[PDB]
Amino acid sequence: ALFGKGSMIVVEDPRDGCGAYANSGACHTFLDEIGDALKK
Amino acid sequence: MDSNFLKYLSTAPVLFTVWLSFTASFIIEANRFFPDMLYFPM
Amino acid sequence: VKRGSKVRILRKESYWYQDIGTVATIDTSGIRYPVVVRFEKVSYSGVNTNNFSLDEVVEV
Amino acid sequence: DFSAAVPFLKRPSNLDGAYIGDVGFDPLGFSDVFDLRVLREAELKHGRFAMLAVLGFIVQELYTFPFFPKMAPVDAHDYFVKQGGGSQIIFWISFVELFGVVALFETLQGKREPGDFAFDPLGLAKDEATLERYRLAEVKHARLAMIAIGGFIHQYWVTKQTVLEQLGNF
Amino acid sequence: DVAGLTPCGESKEFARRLDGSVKKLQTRLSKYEAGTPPALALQKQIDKTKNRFDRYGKAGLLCGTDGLPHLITDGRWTHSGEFVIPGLLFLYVAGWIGWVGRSYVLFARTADKPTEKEIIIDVPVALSFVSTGFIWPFSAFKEFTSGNLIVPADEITVSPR
Amino acid sequence: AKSKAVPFLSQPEALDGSMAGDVGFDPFGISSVIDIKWLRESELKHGRICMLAATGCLVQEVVHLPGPAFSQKMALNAWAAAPRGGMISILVAIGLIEMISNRFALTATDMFANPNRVPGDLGFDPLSLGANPANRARFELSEVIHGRAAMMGFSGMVHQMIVSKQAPIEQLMHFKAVDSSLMKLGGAAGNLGY
Numbered sequence: 001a002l003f004g005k006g007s008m009i010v011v012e013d014p015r016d017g018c019g020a021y022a023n024s025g026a027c028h029t030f031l032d033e034i035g036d037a038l039k040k
Numbered sequence: 041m042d043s044n045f046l047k048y049l050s051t052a053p054v055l056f057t058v059w060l061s062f063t064a065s066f067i068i069e070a071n072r073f074f075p076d077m078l079y080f081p082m
Numbered sequence: 083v084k085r086g087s088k089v090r091i092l093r094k095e096s097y098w099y100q101d102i103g104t105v106a107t108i109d110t111s112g113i114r115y116p117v118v119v120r121f122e123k124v125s126y127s128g129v130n131t132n133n134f135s136l137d138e139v140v141e142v
Numbered sequence: 143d144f145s146a147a148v149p150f151l152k153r154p155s156n157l158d159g160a161y162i163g164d165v166g167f168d169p170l171g172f173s174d175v176f177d178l179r180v181l182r183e184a185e186l187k188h189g190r191f192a193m194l195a196v197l198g199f200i201v202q203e204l205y206t207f208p209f210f211p212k213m214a215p216v217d218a219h220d221y222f223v224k225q226g227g228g229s230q231i232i233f234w235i236s237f238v239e240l241f242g243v244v245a246l247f248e249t250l251q252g253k254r255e256p257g258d259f260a261f262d263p264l265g266l267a268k269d270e271a272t273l274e275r276y277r278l279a280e281v282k283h284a285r286l287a288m289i290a291i292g293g294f295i296h297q298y299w300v301t302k303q304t305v306l307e308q309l310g311n312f
Numbered sequence: 313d314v315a316g317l318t319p320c321g322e323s324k325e326f327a328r329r330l331d332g333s334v335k336k337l338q339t340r341l342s343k344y345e346a347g348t349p350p351a352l353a354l355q356k357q358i359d360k361t362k363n364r365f366d367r368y369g370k371a372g373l374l375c376g377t378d379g380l381p382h383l384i385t386d387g388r389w390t391h392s393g394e395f396v397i398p399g400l401l402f403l404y405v406a407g408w409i410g411w412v413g414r415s416y417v418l419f420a421r422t423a424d425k426p427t428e429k430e431i432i433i434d435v436p437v438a439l440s441f442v443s444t445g446f447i448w449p450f451s452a453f454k455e456f457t458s459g460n461l462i463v464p465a466d467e468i469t470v471s472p473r
Numbered sequence: 474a475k476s477k478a479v480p481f482l483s484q485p486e487a488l489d490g491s492m493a494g495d496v497g498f499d500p501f502g503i504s505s506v507i508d509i510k511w512l513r514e515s516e517l518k519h520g521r522i523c524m525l526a527a528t529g530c531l532v533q534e535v536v537h538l539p540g541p542a543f544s545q546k547m548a549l550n551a552w553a554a555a556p557r558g559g560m561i562s563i564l565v566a567i568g569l570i571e572m573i574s575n576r577f578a579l580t581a582t583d584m585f586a587n588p589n590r591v592p593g594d595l596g597f598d599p600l601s602l603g604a605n606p607a608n609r610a611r612f613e614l615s616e617v618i619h620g621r622a623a624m625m626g627f628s629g630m631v632h633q634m635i636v637s638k639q640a641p642i643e644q645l646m647h648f649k650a651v652d653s654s655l656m657k658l659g660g661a662a663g664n665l666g667y
C-alpha cells in the first residue's frame with residue numbers, strides 16, 4: 001500500500017477536543033474572544 | 041498621469057538615478073539584515 | 083548600381099568602409115565618382131553623404 | 143460684475159457659477175492662479191473629513207466601544223498613536239487615497255466632477271434637481287464643519303472640557 | 313592548514329582581535345549612563361562585533377599570523393564559498409545585465425528614431441527585456457550557434473591598416 | 474464606459490469583459506502598459522500556486538507524512554525542518570516543469586510566439602474534465618475566483634503565522650490577541666537606528 005505499520009501516515013485533530021464557542025479551561029477560540037470583547 | 045510627464049520620467053538621467061538608487065537601496069537593506077557577508081556561507 | 087539600392091562600401095579610406103549605405107543618384111557624365119551614397123551614421127566631420135566610384139561600391 | 147457675497151469686491155472671474163456653492167468669495171485670488179477642480183477636490187475632501195470628525199468628537203463623548211478604554215478624543219489620538227490603531231487608520235485611509243489619486247487625475251483630465259466618487263448606496267439622490275440641492279447642502283455643511291472642528295479642538299485645549307460637557311457646564 | 317594557515321576558531325590572534333575590539337567599545341561605553349541612547353548604541357555595537365567574530369570562527373575561514381581571515385582561491389572545494397560560488401553568482405548577474413542591454417540595443421535599432429530610444433527609454437519594452445535575463449546562458453548560446461551573436465568580419469568597419 | 478468595479482473611474486482598455494473574472498478592475502492601468510495575455514498568465518499561475526499553498530498550510534496542520542522530519546504543525550517551521558535535499562529536489566522539479574510545460578517559450582519576449590498559445594492554458598487536462606464546452610465558462614470563472622481568494626488567504630495565513638507563532642486553525646482554536654508591545658511596525662529610522 002506504500003505505508004507500513006512503521007512509518008504510517010500521521011492524522012491528528014486540530015480542534016483539540018473543544019468547541020467553537022463557550023469554552024472553559026485551556027481552550028479559548030477566536031469566537032470566544034469575539035464574545036469576550038463584546039462583554040467587557 | 042500626463043504622458044509628457046511620464047515621457048520626462050523615461051529620460052536617461054531620471055531612470056539612471058532611480059535605478060541605481062533602487063539598486064543602492066537593496067544593497068543597503070541586504071547589508072542591514074545580513075551584515076558582514078565575507079563569504080558565501082557553505 | 084541603382085538608386086534606392088543598399089551597398090557595401092569598399093573604399094579603404096572611407097569612414098564607412100565595409101558598412102551599408104543607400105544609393106541616392108548616379109551621374110551619367112564623365113564624373114570620376116558618380117555614385118552618391120547616404121549613410122545613417124555620421125562621420126567624424128558630421129557628414130552623412132559621399133560620392134564613390136562603381137568599383138568602390140558593391141551591392142548587398 | 144461684483145461678488146454676490148462681498149458687494150464691494152469684484153467677482154473673481156474664474157467663478158461664474160460653474161461650481162455649486164459659489165458666492166463669488168475669493169479675495170486673495172487663489173482661483174486666478176490655481177485649478178478650481180483641484181481646489182474643489184481639496185475643499186470637499188477637507189470638508190468630508192471635518193464633518194466625520196465633528197460627528198466622531200460628539201459620539202465618542204456619548205459612547206465608546208467596550209474593548210477600548212474611555213477617554214477624551216485628543217487623548218484618543220495619542221493613545222492610538224502608541225497603541226497601533228492609528229497606524230491601521232492611516233494605512234487604510236492611505237490605501238483609499240491611492241485610488242483617490244487616480245480619481246483626481248481623472249478629474250484633471252475632464253471626465254469626473256471634483257467631489258464625485260459615485261457613492262450613492264442608498265439611492266438618496268432620486269432626481270437631478272434633488273442632487274443639486276443636496277450638493278449645495280453638502281458644500282455648506284462641509285464649510286460649517288471645518289469651522290466647527292477647529293472650535294472643538296482649540297476650546298478643548300484652552301479649557302479642558304469636552305464639547306457636550308462644555309455646553310453642559312458654564 | 314592550507315598554506316601554513318590556522319583555522320580562525322583556534323587561532324589566538326583572532327581571539328585577541330575580538331578582545332581588543334570589544335575593550336575599545338567598552339571604554340567608550342564607560343562614559344555614559346545605562347539607559348541613555350549612546351549606551352544603548354554602543355551595547356548594540358558590542359553585540360554586533362561579538363556576533364561577527366563568532367560567525368567567522370565557525371565558518372571555516374583560515375586566519376593568518378596576523379589573526380585576520382584569509383581567502384583560498386585555487387579552486388579547492390572546501391573553500392568554494394570564498395571565491396568560486398560568489399563568482400558564479402556574479403557571472404550570472406553580469407551576463408544578465410549584458411544580455412538585457414544587448415536585447416534593448418537591438419530593439420532600439422529597429423525604431424523610428426533609434427537615438428531617441430536611448431536617451432528616452434521605452435520603459436514597458438525595457439522592462440520586458442529586463443525580465444528575460446534569467447535564462448541568458450541558454451538564450452545567448454543558442455544566439456551564438458544560430459549565427460546571430462557574432463557578426464562576420466566583412467560587415468565591421470576597420471581602420472585602413 | 475465607466476468601470477463596474479470602480480464606478481467613478483473609466484473602463485480600462487484591454488479589459489473588454491471577454492476574460493473570466495473581468496469586472497473592469499484595473500485602476501492603476503497596469504493592462505495599458507503590460508500586455509493582458511502576460512498578466513492573465515501571471516494571475517492564473519500565482520493563483521494556482523496559492524491554491525495549493527493555502528491547502529498545504531491547512532492539510533500540513535492536520536495530516537503529516539511519517540517521521541520526525543515531517544512533524545511540523547506550524548507551516549513556517551516545516552520549511553526549516555523538512556529535508557534540504559528533497560526541498561531542493563522540489564525546486565529543480567519545478568524548474569524542469571516550467572521549461573517543458575511552457576515548451577521553451579519562457580521569456581516575456583518569446584512566450585505566446587505561437588498564436589495558438591492561450592493565457593493560462595498549458596494543455597493540462599489529464600482526466601479531460603474540461604472536455605465539455607458547456608462547463609468551460611464557469612470553470613474558467615471559478616478557477617480565477619479560487620485563485621484570487623487563495624492568494625488573499627495564503628497571504629493572511631503566512632503573516633498571521635509570523636505575528637502568532639501558531640499553525641492557522643490551531644491559532645483559530647487557541648486565539649490570543651496582539652499585546653502591541655511586540656511586533657512593532659517600522660521604527661528603524663525613528664530611533665535613528667539600533
Ligand code: CLA
Nearest residue numbers: 409410411412413414415416417430433437438439441442
Ligand atoms: C549593456 C550594454 C553593453 C554591453 C553588452 C557591452 C559589452 C561589452 N563592452 Mg561595453 N560599454 C557600455 C555598454 C555595454 N558594453 C557602456 C554604456 C559603456 C560606457 C561606459 C561601455 C564602455 C566599454 C569599454 C571602455 C570597454 C567595453 C568593453 C566591452 C566588452 C567586454 C565586457 C566589458 O569589458 O564590460 C565593460 C563594461 C563597461 C566598461 C561599462 C558597462 C556599463 C554598464 C554596467 C553597462 C551598460 C548598462 C546599460 C545602460 C544597459 C541598459 C539596459 C536597459 C536599456 C534594458 C563587451 C563587448 C571592453 C572591450 O572592448 O573589451 C573587448 C572595453 O574595454 N565597454
Ligand code: CLA
Nearest residue numbers: 002538542555556557558559560561562563564565566567
Ligand atoms: C531522480 C529521482 C529521485 C530520487 C532518486 C530521489 C531520492 C530521494 N528523495 Mg526525492 N524527489 C524527486 C526525485 C527523486 N528523489 C523529485 C522529482 C521531487 C520533487 C517532486 C522529490 C521530492 C522529495 C522530497 C520532498 C523528499 C525527497 C526525499 C528523498 C530521499 C529519500 C527517499 C525515500 O526514503 O523514499 C522512501 C519514501 C517514500 C517512497 C515516501 C513517498 C511519499 C509520497 C509518495 C509523497 C507524495 C508525492 C506528491 C503527490 C508529490 C506531487 C508533486 C509532483 C508530481 C511534482 C532520497 C534521497 C526525502 C528526503 O530528502 O529525505 C531525506 C524528502 O523529504 N524527495
Ligand SMILES: CCCCCCCCCCCCCCCCCC(=O)OC[C@H](CO[C@@H]1O[C@H](CO)[C@H](O)[C@H](O)[C@H]1O)OC(=O)CCCCCCCCCCCCCCCCC
Nearest residue numbers: 015017018019020021022023024030031032033034035038
Ligand atoms: C457524498 C458526500 C456527503 C458529505 C456529507 C457531509 C458534508 C455535507 C456538507 C456539510 C457542510 C458543513 C456542515 C457542518 C458539518 C459539521 C457539523 C458539526 O458538527 O460541526 C462541528 C461544530 C460543532 O462541533 C460540536 O462540538 C461540540 C462540543 O464542543 C459537540 O460535542 C460536538 O462535538 C459537535 O456538535 O460545528 C460548528 O462549530 C458550527 C458553528 C456555527 C455554524 C453556523 C451555525 C448556523 C448558522 C447561524 C450562525 C449565525 C451566526 C451569526 C454571527 C455570530 C457571531 C458569533
Ligand SMILES: CCCCCCCCCCCCCCCC(=O)OC[C@H](COP(=O)(O)OC[C@@H](O)CO)OC(=O)CCCCCCCCCCCCCCC
Nearest residue numbers: 062065229230232233657658659660661662663664665666
Ligand atoms: C498589492 C500589494 C499591496 C501591499 C500593501 C503593503 C502592506 C504593508 C505596507 C505597510 C503597512 C503599514 C506601515 C506602517 C509601518 C510604518 O509606517 O513604519 C514607519 C517607518 C518609518 O519609521 P518612523 O520614522 O515612523 O519611526 C517612528 C517612531 O515611532 C519609532 O522609531 O516607515 C517606513 O519607512 C517603513 C516602510 C519602508 C519604506 C520603503 C519600503 C520598501 C520600498 C520598496 C519600493 C516601494 C514599495 C511601496 C513602499 C510604501
Ligand SMILES: CC1=C(C#C/C(C)=C/C=C/C(C)=C/C=C/C=C(C)/C=C/C=C(\C)C#CC2=C(C)C[C@@H](O)CC2(C)C)C(C)(C)C[C@H](O)C1
Nearest residue numbers: 193194196197261262263264265266283286287290293294
Ligand atoms: C454620502 C452618502 C451617505 C453618508 C454619510 C454621512 C456619514 C454623513 C454625515 C454628515 C455629517 C456628519 C454632517 C455634519 C455636519 C457638521 C456641522 C455642519 C457642524 C456643526 C457644528 C456647529 C455649527 C458648531 C459649533 C460650536 C463650537 C465650534 C464649539 C462649542 O463649544 C460651541 C458650539 C456647539 C456652538 C450615505 C452612507 C447615507 C448614503 C448615501 O447614498 C451617500
Ligand SMILES: CC1=C(C#C/C(C)=C/C=C/C(C)=C/C=C/C=C(C)/C=C/C=C(\C)C#CC2=C(C)C[C@@H](O)CC2(C)C)C(C)(C)C[C@H](O)C1
Nearest residue numbers: 007518521522538539540541542543559563567570571574
Ligand atoms: C511549476 C509551476 C506551479 C507550481 C508549484 C509548486 C509550489 C509546487 C510544489 C510542489 C511540491 C511541494 C511537491 C512536493 C513533493 C513531495 C514529495 C515528492 C515527498 C516525498 C517524500 C519522501 C520521498 C519520503 C520520505 C521518508 C523519509 C526519507 C524518512 C522517514 O522518517 C520519513 C518518510 C517516511 C516520509 C504550478 C503548477 C502551480 C503552475 C505553473 O505550472 C508553474
Ligand SMILES: CC1=C(C#C/C(C)=C/C=C/C(C)=C/C=C/C=C(C)/C=C/C=C(\C)C#CC2=C(C)C[C@@H](O)CC2(C)C)C(C)(C)C[C@H](O)C1
Nearest residue numbers: 498499500501502519522526529530548549551552624628
Ligand atoms: C488587480 C489590481 C490591483 C491588485 C492587487 C493585489 C492585492 C494583488 C496581490 C496579489 C498576491 C497576494 C499575490 C500572492 C502571491 C503568492 C504566492 C505566489 C505564494 C507563494 C508561496 C509558496 C510557493 C509556498 C509555500 C509554503 C507551504 C504552503 C508550506 C510551508 O511549510 C512552507 C512555505 C511557506 C514555503 C491593484 C490594487 C494593484 C490596482 C491594479 O490596477 C488592479
Ligand SMILES: CC1=C(C#C/C(C)=C/C=C/C(C)=C/C=C/C=C(C)/C=C/C=C(\C)C#CC2=C(C)C[C@@H](O)CC2(C)C)C(C)(C)C[C@H](O)C1
Nearest residue numbers: 524525527528598599600601602619622623626629630641
Ligand atoms: C484542473 C485539473 C485537475 C485539478 C486539480 C486541483 C489540485 C484542484 C485543487 C484546487 C484547490 C486546492 C483549491 C483551493 C482553494 C483555496 C481557497 C479558495 C482558500 C481560500 C482561503 C481563504 C479565503 C482564507 C483564510 C484564513 C485567513 C487568512 C485567516 C486564518 O486565521 C483563518 C482562515 C483559514 C479563514 C485535475 C488534476 C484533477 C485533472 C483535471 O483534468 C484538470
Ligand SMILES: CC1=C(C#C/C(C)=C/C=C/C(C)=C/C=C/C=C(C)/C=C/C=C(C)/C=C/C2=C(C)CCCC2(C)C)C(C)(C)C[C@H](O)C1
Nearest residue numbers: 167192215216217219220223288289290291292293295296
Ligand atoms: C497637532 C495635534 C492635533 C490636531 C489638530 C487639529 C485638526 C487642529 C485644527 C485646526 C483647524 C481646523 C483650525 C480652524 C481654523 C478656522 C478658523 C480660524 C476660522 C476663521 C474665520 C474667520 C477669521 C472669519 C471668517 C469670515 C466671517 C466674518 C464669517 C463667514 C465666513 C468668513 C467671511 C470667511 C491632535 C488633535 C491630533 C493632537 C495631536 O496629538 C497633535
